Amino acid sequence: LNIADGHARQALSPGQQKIVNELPVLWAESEQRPVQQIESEAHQAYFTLLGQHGYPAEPGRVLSCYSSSVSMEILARSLSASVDRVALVHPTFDNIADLLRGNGLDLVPVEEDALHGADLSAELLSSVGCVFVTTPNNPTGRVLAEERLRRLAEQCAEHGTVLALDTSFRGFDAAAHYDHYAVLQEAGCRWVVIEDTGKLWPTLDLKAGLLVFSEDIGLPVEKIYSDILLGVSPLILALIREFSRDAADGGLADLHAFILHNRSVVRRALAGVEGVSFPDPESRSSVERVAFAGRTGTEVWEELQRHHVFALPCRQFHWAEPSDGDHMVRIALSRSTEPLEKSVQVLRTVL
Amino acid sequence: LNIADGHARQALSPGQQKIVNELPVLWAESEQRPVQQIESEAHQAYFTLLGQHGYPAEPGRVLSCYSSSVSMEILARSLSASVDRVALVHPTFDNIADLLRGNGLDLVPVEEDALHGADLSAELLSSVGCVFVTTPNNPTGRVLAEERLRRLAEQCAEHGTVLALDTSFRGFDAAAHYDHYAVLQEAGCRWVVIEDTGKLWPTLDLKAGLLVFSEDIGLPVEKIYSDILLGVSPLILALIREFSRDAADGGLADLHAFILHNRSVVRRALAGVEGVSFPDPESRSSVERVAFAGRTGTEVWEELQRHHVFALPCRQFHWAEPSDGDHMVRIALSRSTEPLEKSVQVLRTVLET
Numbered sequence: 001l002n003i004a005d006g007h008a009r010q011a012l013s014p015g016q017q018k019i020v021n022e023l024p025v026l027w028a029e030s031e032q033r034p035v036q037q038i039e040s041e042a043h044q045a046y047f048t049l050l051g052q053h054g055y056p057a058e059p060g061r062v063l064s065c066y067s068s069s070v071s072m073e074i075l076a077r078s079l080s081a082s083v084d085r086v087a088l089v090h091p092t093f094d095n096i097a098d099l100l101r102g103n104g105l106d107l108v109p110v111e112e113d114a115l116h117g118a119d120l121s122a123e124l125l126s127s128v129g130c131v132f133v134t135t136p137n138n139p140t141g142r143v144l145a146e147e148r149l150r151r152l153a154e155q156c157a158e159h160g161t162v163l164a165l166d167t168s169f170r171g172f173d174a175a176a177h178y179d180h181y182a183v184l185q186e187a188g189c190r191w192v193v194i195e196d197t198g199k200l201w202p203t204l205d206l207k208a209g210l211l212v213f214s215e216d217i218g219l220p221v222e223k224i225y226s227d228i229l230l231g232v233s234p235l236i237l238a239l240i241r242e243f244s245r246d247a248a249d250g251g252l253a254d255l256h257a258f259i260l261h262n263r264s265v266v267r268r269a270l271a272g273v274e275g276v277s278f279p280d281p282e283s284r285s286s287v288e289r290v291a292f293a294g295r296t297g298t299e300v301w302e303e304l305q306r307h308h309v310f311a312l313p314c315r316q317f318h319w320a321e322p323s324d325g326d327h328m329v330r331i332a333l334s335r336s337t338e339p340l341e342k343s344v345q346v347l348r349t350v351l
Numbered sequence: 352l353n354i355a356d357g358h359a360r361q362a363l364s365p366g367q368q369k370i371v372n373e374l375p376v377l378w379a380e381s382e383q384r385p386v387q388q389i390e391s392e393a394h395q396a397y398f399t400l401l402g403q404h405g406y407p408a409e410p411g412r413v414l415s416c417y418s419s420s421v422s423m424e425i426l427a428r429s430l431s432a433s434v435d436r437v438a439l440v441h442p443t444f445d446n447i448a449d450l451l452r453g454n455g456l457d458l459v460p461v462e463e464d465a466l467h468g469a470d471l472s473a474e475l476l477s478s479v480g481c482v483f484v485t486t487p488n489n490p491t492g493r494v495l496a497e498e499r500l501r502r503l504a505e506q507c508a509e510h511g512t513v514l515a516l517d518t519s520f521r522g523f524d525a526a527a528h529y530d531h532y533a534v535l536q537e538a539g540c541r542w543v544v545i546e547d548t549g550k551l552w553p554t555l556d557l558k559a560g561l562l563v564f565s566e567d568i569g570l571p572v573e574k575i576y577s578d579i580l581l582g583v584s585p586l587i588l589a590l591i592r593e594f595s596r597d598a599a600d601g602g603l604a605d606l607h608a609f610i611l612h613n614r615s616v617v618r619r620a621l622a623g624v625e626g627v628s629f630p631d632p633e634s635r636s637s638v639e640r641v642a643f644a645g646r647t648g649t650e651v652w653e654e655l656q657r658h659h660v661f662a663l664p665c666r667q668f669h670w671a672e673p674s675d676g677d678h679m680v681r682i683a684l685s686r687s688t689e690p691l692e693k694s695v696q697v698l699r700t701v702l703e704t
């Protein structure tokens with residue numbers, strides 16, 4: 001009973017199963033057509049699905065990568081050409097910190113209340129070459145509102161700072177479906193966005209990271225991209241195109257209802273336990289934090305494993321101060337509902 | 352007419368096409384079985400296909416990556432933790448130089464005749480922390496023979512040097528199907544091998560790099576791998592397993608005959624042309640170098656493009672001394688024979704003008 005990894009493992013819907021049954025036809029098409037044409041259609045379907053109508057649609061502006069973490073490796077190594085220190089939201093997906101640190105960047109944490117609630121200070125912005133925001137955030141689900149994105153992009157433009165966004169969880173939360181590219185382009189800051197198809201649908205990790213950047217980004221992202229790959233399989237792009245079209249034709253609303261159902265299953269099973277609470281009441285993401293008293297998430301993780309249930313302690317997401325995550329675990333919701341419910345009834349007994 | 356990029360674009364064989372038409376079944380299997388089991392089957396089929404029986408088969412010793420270039424990024428960044436300089440075969444696949452340089456490594460070229468024909472000097476081995484060999488080499492097709500691999504591994508063991516091999520072209524040349532892992536493990540050097548499925552078959556870039564390394568590698572490769580990915584799609588692993596089993600069932604013999612046929616097309620179309628020669632007569636790789644005395648590979652490449660044929664000049668592969676490649680172009684052979692023949696016919700016309 002795995003409730004750890006964020007990638008989707010629930011059953012395909014009937015519409016998605018139809019796409020899988022057409023793989024031999026998508027192969028035929030991918031053999032026959034120029035990859036750039038399938039790529040453009042995949043990008044258009046995915047960006048427009050999620051409200052990002054102002055994305056730059058000229059060939060070459062959106063660089064398709066094998067994954068979002070490959071995009072992040074490209075960006076991190078590019079940043080290291082001209083940047084020493086990066087401001088990074090805390091907590092967040094820890095691979096981002098690992099890839100930045102591994103490419104030689106010093107990291108400055110920005111807590112979520114500072115990031116959403118107020119302008120970044122001049123002292124902070126004057127000490128970093130890049131501000132990095134995951135939105136919706138993993139693990140918290142917190143969405144950077146349009147008014148704050150606009151102010152943050154304006155601040156980065158004044159300070160000469162790169163604004164970088166990781167939007168892997170975008171598909172799960174309609175509040176993240178306002179047009180981010182329209183905001184970024186009107187502010188005129190140096191900007192980069194890493195989109196990701198990989199967390200949305202159960203595609204057996206067939207996915208792309210989509211690296212998008214301003215024309216004045218002033219980092220060697222295109223050169224380093226080209227040292228790592230020429231592009232992704234046209235079959236994967238064709239799959240992204242078809243899953244996005246199924247999503248636009250009702251699949252995405254069904255996904256949101258599914259995640260909401262599983263989130264409610266978790267909260268229903270655990271809410272009666274004294275001292276158990278849900279740190280992110282309004283999250284719509286596919287992962288769910290649970291807080292408890294009297295024990296650590298590491299101890300809960302150890303006990304769950306004895307019962308063959310695999311969840312995640314939260315320490316690792318607090319990449320700057322791990323003890324901040326000591327009294328929480330994270331539960332993956334992109335799972336079939338029956339195994340998920342059995343897992344949380346085990347967690348209920350533990351807590 | 353593209354005869355530039357080395358990736359395979361020929362039609363599927365009947366055995367491969369059967370696999371493609373069963374892709375929904377591989378999907379169903381991937382939903383039902385643990386990825387680790389499918390992965391182990393995929394590794395077993397690919398390594399044993401190409402004679403690498405001594406590969407480390409314990410789960411987690413072979414790291415599956417999205418591509419061989421992702422494997423190389425992981426290796427390059429891993430090296431930079433403790434290595435400043437790398438000895439690299441020259442010429443070679445010049446992306447390797449770009450990935451190493453981009454991660455802060457300084458490069459020392461080793462010409463092929465020196466690498467294959469004699470021991471490396473002690474002065475080189477005290478000046479580099481890694482020796483990097485592409486075998487079979489791209490673009491030359493030259494294969495590191497077993498006796499020289501053993502001496503290289505022994506020299507690297509004596510000096511605490513990492514021996515790194517990029518074996519993307521292995522499947523094409525039976526001379527590279529002696530067991531490299533047996534040699535490396537007996538020599539006891541620090542070693543890393545990057546296997547690659549992506550050049551063999553027309554799989555629309557559905558592929559894996561396989562990053563394999565010794566237990567004493569002494570580089571943070573496992574950490575950096577895991578910072579970049581958890582693993583590769585079970586569907587791609589199942590595809591690799593199935594293509595490897597088809598290749599074991601006659602498909603690999605058919606592939607060698609197909610490449611030999613296309614190489615023969617190129618050579619018979621150009622051998623009568625004044626000033627043409629083929630520097631790598633014994634190459635069995637899917638790319639082919641062609642030399643000329645009368646003109647520059649760049650000028651030939653430019654004239655080909657006016658006629659809608661896209662090949663590659665060789666300067667780029669001579670990443671340390673580009674003028675060494677000034678009189679050669681490279682031709683991709685993993686192509687349907689008919690377009691390839693059209694391509695080399697334009698080239699013949701250009702060279703005859």
Ligand SMILES: [Cl-]
Pocket residue numbers: 005006007138
């Ligand atoms: Cl995750």
Ligand SMILES: [Cl-]
Pocket residue numbers: 356357358489
């Ligand atoms: Cl190539």
Ligand SMILES: [Mg+2]
Pocket residue numbers: 445446667670
């Ligand atoms: Mg080059």
